[PDB]
Amino acid sequence: VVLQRRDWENPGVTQLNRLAAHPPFASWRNSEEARTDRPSQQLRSLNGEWRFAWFPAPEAVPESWLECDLPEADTVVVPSNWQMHGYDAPIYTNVTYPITVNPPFVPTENPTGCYSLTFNVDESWLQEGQTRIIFDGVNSAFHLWCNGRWVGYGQDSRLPSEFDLSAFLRAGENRLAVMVLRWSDGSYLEDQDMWRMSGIFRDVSLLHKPTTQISDFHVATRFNDDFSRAVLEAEVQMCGELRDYLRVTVSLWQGETQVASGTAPFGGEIIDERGGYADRVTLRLNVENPKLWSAEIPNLYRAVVELHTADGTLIEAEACDVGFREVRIENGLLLLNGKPLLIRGVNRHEHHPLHGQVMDEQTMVQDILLMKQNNFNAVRCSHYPNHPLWYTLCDRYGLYVVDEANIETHGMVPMNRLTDDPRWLPAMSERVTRMVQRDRNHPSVIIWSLGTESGHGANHDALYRWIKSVDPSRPVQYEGGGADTTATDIICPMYARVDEDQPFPAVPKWSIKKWLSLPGETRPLILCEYAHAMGNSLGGFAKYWQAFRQYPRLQGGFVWDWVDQSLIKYDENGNPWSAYGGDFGDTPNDRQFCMNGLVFADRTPHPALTEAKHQQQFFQFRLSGQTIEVTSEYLFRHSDNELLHWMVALDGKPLASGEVPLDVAPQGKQLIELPELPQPESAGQLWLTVRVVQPNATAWSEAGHISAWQQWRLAENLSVTLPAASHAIPHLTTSEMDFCIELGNKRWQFNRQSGFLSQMWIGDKKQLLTPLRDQFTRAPLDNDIGVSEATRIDPNAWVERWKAAGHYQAEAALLQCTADTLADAVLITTAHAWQHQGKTLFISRKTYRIDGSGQMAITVDVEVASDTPHPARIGLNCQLAQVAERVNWLGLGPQENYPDRLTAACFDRWDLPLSDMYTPYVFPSENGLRCGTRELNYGPHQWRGDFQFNISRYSQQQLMETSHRHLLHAEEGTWLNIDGFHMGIGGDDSWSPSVSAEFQLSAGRYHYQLVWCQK
Amino acid sequence: VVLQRRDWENPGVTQLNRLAAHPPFASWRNSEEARTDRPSQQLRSLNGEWRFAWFPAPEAVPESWLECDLPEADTVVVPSNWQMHGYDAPIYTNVTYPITVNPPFVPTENPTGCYSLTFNVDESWLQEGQTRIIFDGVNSAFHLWCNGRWVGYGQDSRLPSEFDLSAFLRAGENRLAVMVLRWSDGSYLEDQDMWRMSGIFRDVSLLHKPTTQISDFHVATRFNDDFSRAVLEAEVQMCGELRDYLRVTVSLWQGETQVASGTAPFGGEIIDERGGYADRVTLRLNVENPKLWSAEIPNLYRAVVELHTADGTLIEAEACDVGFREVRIENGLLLLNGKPLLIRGVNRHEHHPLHGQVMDEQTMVQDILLMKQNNFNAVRCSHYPNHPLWYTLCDRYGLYVVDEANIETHGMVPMNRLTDDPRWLPAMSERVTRMVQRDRNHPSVIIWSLGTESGHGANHDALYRWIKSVDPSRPVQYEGGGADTTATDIICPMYARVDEDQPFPAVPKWSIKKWLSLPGETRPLILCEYAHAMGNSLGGFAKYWQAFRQYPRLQGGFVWDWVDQSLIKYDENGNPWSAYGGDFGDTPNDRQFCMNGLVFADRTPHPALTEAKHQQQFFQFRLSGQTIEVTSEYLFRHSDNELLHWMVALDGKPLASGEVPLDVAPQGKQLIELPELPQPESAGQLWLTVRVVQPNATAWSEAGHISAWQQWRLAENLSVTLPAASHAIPHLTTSEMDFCIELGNKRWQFNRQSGFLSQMWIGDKKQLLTPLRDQFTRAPLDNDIGVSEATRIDPNAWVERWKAAGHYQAEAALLQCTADTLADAVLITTAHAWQHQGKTLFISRKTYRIDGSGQMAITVDVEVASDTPHPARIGLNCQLAQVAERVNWLGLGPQENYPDRLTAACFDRWDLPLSDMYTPYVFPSENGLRCGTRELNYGPHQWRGDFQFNISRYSQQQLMETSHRHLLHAEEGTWLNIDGFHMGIGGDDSWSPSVSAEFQLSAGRYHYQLVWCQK
Ligand SMILES: [Mg+2]
Ligand SMILES: [Mg+2]
Ligand SMILES: [Mg+2]
Ligand SMILES: [Mg+2]
Ligand code: NA
Ligand code: NA
Ligand code: NA
Ligand code: NA
Ligand code: NA
Ligand code: NA
16 A cells, blocks of 8 residues: 555645654653653664665565575664665755656655664553653654554654654564655655754664653743743643543752752633633643853753642653743844844754765764864754754753744746645645744754755745744744745844845845835844855955944844855875765765855865854954043943953064953943053054953853953054165176176066066075966965856856956967166066967066065065956066975965955964965865064065065965865965965855955056065 | 654644644646636645444554555545534533543543545646645644555644655545544643544645745735725745745736735845844835725635745746734734724534534534624634635625634533633633634734633733734734733623623623722723523623623623534434433533524524514614614714615504605614604504615625614503493302303303313303413423522522522412402402412402403412512413414514513514424523514404413423423423513523623512403
């Protein structure tokens, strides 16, 4: 019958014989074990070694398999995705569905996973009560057999499916058989931008409950106006036979102290003309001066729910963690415990590079620590309900959660083709309701979300009202259909810009500042997705946070996203490398669009991460005279684990420094008086750096953790002294093909046909492998490329503007090249013009001055044609012969920084190994820049001026021709790029031009100067 | 798989392979036929003779039935209910489920109907296009096979279920097999107070459409401030292969005149980031000064939707009737076309005494004509979507409709057990959504309803918002959970009273005047059920209408209900009788509670109908001197078919009459002067009577139809003349046992032991069969009985208060009986005491004065113990010897009227046959009373005074002992009851006391006088 019905091609059938959803159960038979959240004997794990066989379709599955293990089958770990074991390929597609769009049908070649397990069941579990099996995650649909008999069917990859096995088991050995289909009618609602995989990827377990049992329970907390009194309200439901002797007790614990308690018989209030719920009871407990829950201080109580007899004999007990907090919207502001929130959030998919989409505790804890260490306070479950342990961990560590239902239909045309169709309402409702029924008691969950990218349909409206009706404690949001529909309490756009309107038809993304004050609008605005962190990204990030602070109704957003979705492949010699879309034969695919993280697959930080930490600081600073003003952005806590370190330095050289304790109230101010500063000996700029240090370790950080910092310029003494004139005078040697200059053990050569410095000698040794030439291009970033491909060009992306304008193909034509001997120097003058098909793009005019002391002063003036696309950079490059261990500079650092992403960097003297001067982005591009530099040292070379640079073993050319980082090979010597000017990187999104006007190189005339010498 | 799946015990499966729901289609291939609504060749009826066999379960059905006709099966007529043909019993239950409550399961003994049909299909339908089958109604679930192969499955008994037969049909003979189950998981949502039947009870048809087709269309009409401009908006959706040459044209017609037109290609406006619906188009037509639709004047246009090509080739045509009207709630008022409605409504089930739940045109038309003739302007579809033809007739004749979803869970405990469970959301949503998708283009449908008596659950909220999202042109209403929840735009209580609060816990029925002004309340109030019309009922009906008129926000209600649900059975002689609950072996049952109508099952009126007509009049009246002031309650029309008849009479005798045209604007007044009336000579009371008459016939009434009336007392001249002094004197004859009085041929006898008038003689004929005695009781009405039964007594009911107090068993004790001889008369004086168990209930003191003219003046004074329950009446009864043909009276008439139901009756001189003085209620009770009577004539007898009376061949004893009207037999002679005072009949409901305080007999001391003579 099962192969005849094809329930996996019927959106009217989403389960068969499946049990009702509920909060996490353990069925404790002792109240103390429940209180302390220790393991339960009534909850067994079935994870471990199972039997597995792969089939191309469900028609290919032999009928013997229902009763006998297949000898052809293998032994594999569960939980797992079968693509991670090599049985078939994982696919990466973004918008376009991985199957033909023909609802409700799927392909006839539908890969099939046959899992089986032989296991023991104890006699005690069968004599009394109810034994159930629980599958936490099966992708995407499945049929279940026990001892050869059919049990039932289930869909939705991301929520538990449970079945009663009481009538099916025997004492001793038992056999489970699970048939997992890769594709089903459920797939039409699971079109998230991620790897498409399948199998049993979350926990399997077995739970024993009594016959008379707790079948559901709800906890609520409401408050008086000043939060000095609370009422905890708990509604409990039972199953089994109803008797007068039955009782529930809900008791509230704080550590080992019981603070409140209530006991009552079953039989709720009268509800209508037919009475009340005889199988339900409500308990109300008064709590005076409750400790409140927030992400700043995650205060938790333990609630224990006991079903028992009047006389006091336990039947069973459940329990959960309780956080006393209020979430409400008033006067256009989202409030937590009466104060306006500021969301420092991120989006987080469940991803591991080795295990695929299987989640474990070690990884989850690793993620939460990094988040909190980097000033984040909120997370979005993009875009499905998470592993149940996630919520418990957020409750305990302190993070605000947006729990989101497993619905995305991005690939339909138009986007709401299913979500407006009443025949898809049943399948949709189950994905929203079963989420709310499971997670409604977690305090970390503050907002419900209806899914993502499914346009706006009437089904969203019904399900919105359903949530508001069953759970008034929490606001509901939904971005689809323009981000401000009747199905959202919060304006929640994706990738809307700070100042810039993007007036798309029907679904415009307004500037967030403008969006608030549209006629009739009153709601708060929090971006569900912003600052697309693909590759070298996060430009313009400070612009959001400046707006967030100034505008009360702008309350933050969630960065896209946390972690790169790369996977590990192995080569011939057995070495691992990071792979993205296409790398498995998967076609069509969306290549590297699956890598948008602030961290790599293995949780190493991208440079963008430090920019997020600095801008998301909790302390704000102002300087007046000798006075630092410190302001706190905390809403509830004092600065009880904070001190201020201050230091003053003269061009990197330390002069004075000290410490002061921080004692600031939430929203308060503290004025710190700096002592009399000693007077500086010499020329240079004085800088002040402050940083907030945490002396004591926490649950989430180490002793000495740095949480905030800020810099200021102090007094400047400009250099007014002439370097006393030297004895020596440089000598010029004119040839037809070269101008050569000599001074002691140093030699310079200017080629008279190319017009550039072709070689330079210290003593006798060659310093250059390539001539010193102008450069107006960069190895293109992901933001520069957008969705542009070889076979389908988008002419609007920056890379295509540059290609079509000939910027990459342009050839330097020499206009002028003269030499003159002066009293104490030699002066070389050059001029070049870069042309493409008869159009002059660039003109570069230079003078090189070599004086008696071996210093070379280079002066550059560039003209750029007003009607060419603004250049990526204006600077110089060369390949040095020398390979040295260390790079030393006086400028912004120590990490990678660009003009629109440099606020986190500080001015000082930095020193790193060469390999650190390279950011290993999986898709290679321009990387490693440092800005605002006054001095650079590498080997015996020193450059001075006011410039930006990168230094590495990889040419811009290798970087732009190579697609995977592991395919790069180090070149002879070190490629040096020194720019007078560099274009911003943008990243408000990664599919259209996103570099803001004030970071484009549009001035038409540019000037910079540099001194090159030996040290 | 069909027997193994058991899809009828699974609320997660409500259909298999069923096509989407849609507005009435006919697939016309000629535009002129679509416009004129003439028959289509592409829509065949399959109604007529089919084959049928009955089984006790689906397991008992032979497999040969799929392949071949069963020799044992009978030929029967479809549509029908198989209970109406005798195959099993119909069941009457009100609240309690007809099956054991154990969701989702049904009994293993499940009466199965096996239907089959052999039919031919036109050759062309096989070559190309799509052939579907439509079942408008199947009760309650079914499986379908064509030519032995399985097609699909269907639930919901009240909306059409459609299937594609294209891959199934063949040349020549085809056979349909339809397996119909009585019970399903669908029955849990179908617990309406009604007979429970089964089968194929609505139409069956075949529809042939092109492969490229119209699959959906919506029509909407919106207006400017004063309705002088309209825009008609029509959205159209297609199925099949998209071609650039395709087009849609929507044209609007009034008769043969095209008023507006619009044409466009497919491809709607951009909706989201993925574009728009390429398979859809939206047309907008301008209409200046549109004829507006209302129930007063049902102005209709015709819209024709053509799917064609660019060069003018038609593919197919659909169509509908369009009414230009706006429905909105503003400032707490329900407005139609800017004006506040006053709903004169009624609930109506689909019921026929012979054919059960099968509807036909003739019965439908008959129903509508009788409603309009009685001043009803609105109907409620209790409690499911009706036969499609009903909405077409309502559009055309003009009645406001409340379309109701087929959801009632009355029998659950608590009432919302299912409707609050997310696992019942899918089954529920299909009942709401598929109603709306079908009926949204009907103009007569002004309000959507979510069902009835299912409590208030979160599923109601979700479906409330769904309707408001897809159709904002109509308010949504729902009564469950207290009548004023968040799932209704209208306060819509059932049986809430005018002045009296009933503060039930959780779900109080506040008095309707009070309900309006509760703190925070702003909504309009229209009762969804009021004035329960069970048996002798509708007392206090005037009180509702007075308040409807004084309070702008009380906008009317729907009477419960239209027609008695009695069925026809046949006895031993084959003579018909009216049957109710229990008479088919059906048990448990709710007896006569299925009979609640204003009309009998055959559409003969109850007396209550005329009271509805009068209180619901559209013209109000005031008299001031010679001035009659007429006011119109019409909102839209002038009195263009209305004249006023006036007449003045002196104690029934005509003195003057006239006619005046009526020309009153909507909400207008008109003053009409009376000519000065000729002076009346003799004593008496003058009465003015006015009626409004329609001189011309309409679509719903004949010429001469009376639509409104009113009466006033004018001048009274009190009688002062002495009667003619008679010359004879009455003689007394005493014995120990009797006082006899004699005058001429006349003779009176008084029993000195009982104390009553025991016999009277006119010459030598006895006039009495039973002595003249006080009576304080009545054969209890349904309102008297309530839910009280022999096996479960309700002590609070009036009949039980009377039974327990001994009213029915009280025996008369004689206290005093004397005779005196005066100058010209004989005086008899009596005193009686009625006692029960040593307690005195009533005392009656009488005098009888028999004088020289032969007249007998009876004076009566009664005491009623304040602590006894107030009596049903204070009067006299006796059984007269004579049986006569006519009854003639001066008083309120001509129909049955009671003290709290007599506003419709007029004071005049009435003359009827004796049988019209008896109302044949199916469950017999007190009936046929007439109030305000000053003179009664019957045979040679005449009674003068100021009394209430009823006259018949049936004693109060027989009426109370007999349960069915057909089991009554005429008694010898005639039973007369003459009351001085009679209690009200009540009727606000029929399950608690409902007679208002001022219509109960509580004065304690009563007085009345009669004169009995032979005229
Ligand atoms: Mg399915
Ligand atoms: Mg997407
Ligand atoms: Mg079913
Ligand atoms: Mg009911
Ligand atoms: Na803000
Ligand atoms: Na992505
Ligand atoms: Na590259
Ligand atoms: Na009113
Ligand atoms: Na009834
Ligand atoms: Na009776």
